[PDB]
Paper text:
To investigate the modifications responsible for this difference in structure selectivity, the crystal structure of a 67RuvC D8N mutant was determined at 1.8 Å resolution. This nuclease deficient mutant corresponds to an EcRuvC D7N mutant, which lacks one of four essential catalytic carboxylates, and was chosen to facilitate co-crystallization efforts in the presence of branched and unbranched DNA substrates. Purified 67RuvC D8N was screened for crystallization and well-diffracting crystals obtained in a P-orthorhombic space group subsequently confirmed as P212121. The structural model was refined against a 1.7 Å data set collected at the high energy remote wavelength. The structures presented here, where D8 has been mutated to an asparagine, confirm that these residues are indeed clustered together in a pocket recessed slightly from the surface of the protein, which is partially obscured by a loop formed by residues 12–16. Overall there is no major difference between the structures with and without Mg2+. Residues that come close to the DNA in the junction include R77 and R79, which protrude into the junction centre. The electron density for the side-chains of these residues is weak in the free enzyme structure but it is quite possible that these residues would become ordered when the protein is in complex with the DNA substrate.
However, unlike EcRuvC, it showed a relaxed structure-specificity, binding and cutting fork and X junctions almost equally well. A non-crystallographic dimer is clearly observed in the asymmetric unit of the crystal consistent with symmetrical resolution of Holliday junctions in vitro and the previous cellular RuvC structures.
Residue numbers in the entry:
A (entry chain B): 2 to 160
B (entry chain A): 1 to 160
Write the structure that this text describes.
């Protein structure tokens, strides 16, 4: 029930990032770690993303939170998919112990509970629509990493 | 001699298989395998057990600051199996990075090529074990190819 929700990406494309969401003293906090940098490898960007999340964990002194992280999946691009799966694992291994374990949340599953339907690109705008309603972000927000992490948290808080 | 902890990572999905490790300390090579076979556990749960076993080795033998050399995960025939394997390999590395001074991926092809090992998987296991057996660290009857691959990664990395 004390859940740190993560939508993990290594930010291999511009503007991407790892989204996070959690609730502390009833207040929801959300954000993204924007790590795009072609001078760094996926694993180096991952290291930076780990250290950003560790800094939030210490700032908000999250003790006993459980990681809910979106399951890595094989996509069309095989090498991207294996790199992402490996970096997703690095991220989980680096923070497990700061969190009390973790659970894989299947994209299809949180999406179905929130009625997000259609392809990938369209899921992104549906997820953002839900984030926008809560007014934790402004009406201009185009951060689907943030929106996904939020929707994963709400999925988990129900399940 | 650069201080390297060589790992041949496996989730021990098959009985008798496990994660191989090799390191040199005070000139002596130490090798072994973590035999984590347990079909009652998921691959991630066996990986957690292997992480704890390597942390205990790093503690007992005072290896903080050794550099981790680990095989690169590869693309395979079955999507879900290869994604799970790649994720567990990642988990292992992220759990111990910090105890070790960083890590480097070692491609299977590169260490094999250095050691003049060719052929399909089972032949490569045989040739890798021949190199390990020659050191006397295991007996002439050893079939523990996870130990052999860890050893042969260590010696490949020691030449670089």
């Amino acid at each position: 029930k004390k859940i740190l929700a993560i939508n993990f990406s290594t930010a291999s494309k511009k503007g991407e990032g790892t989204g996070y969401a959690f609730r502390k003293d009833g207040q929801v906090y959300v954000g993204s770690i924007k790590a795009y940098n072609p001078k760094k490898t996926a694993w180096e960007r991952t290291f930076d993303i780990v250290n950003a999340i560790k800094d939030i964990i210490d700032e908000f002194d999250l003790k006993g939170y459980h990681l809910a992280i979106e399951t890595p999946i094989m996509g069309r691009n095989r090498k991207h998919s294996i790199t992402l799966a490996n970096c997703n694992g690095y991220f989980i291994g680096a923070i497990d112990g700061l969190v009390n374990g973790y659970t894989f949340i299947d994209n299809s599953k949180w999406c179905s509970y929130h009625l997000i339907s259609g392809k990938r690109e369209q899921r992104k705008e549906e997820s953002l629509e839900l984030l926008k309603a809560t007014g934790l972000v402004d009406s201009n927000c185009k951060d689907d990493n943030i929106a996904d992490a939020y929707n994963i948290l709400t999925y988990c808080e129900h399940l």
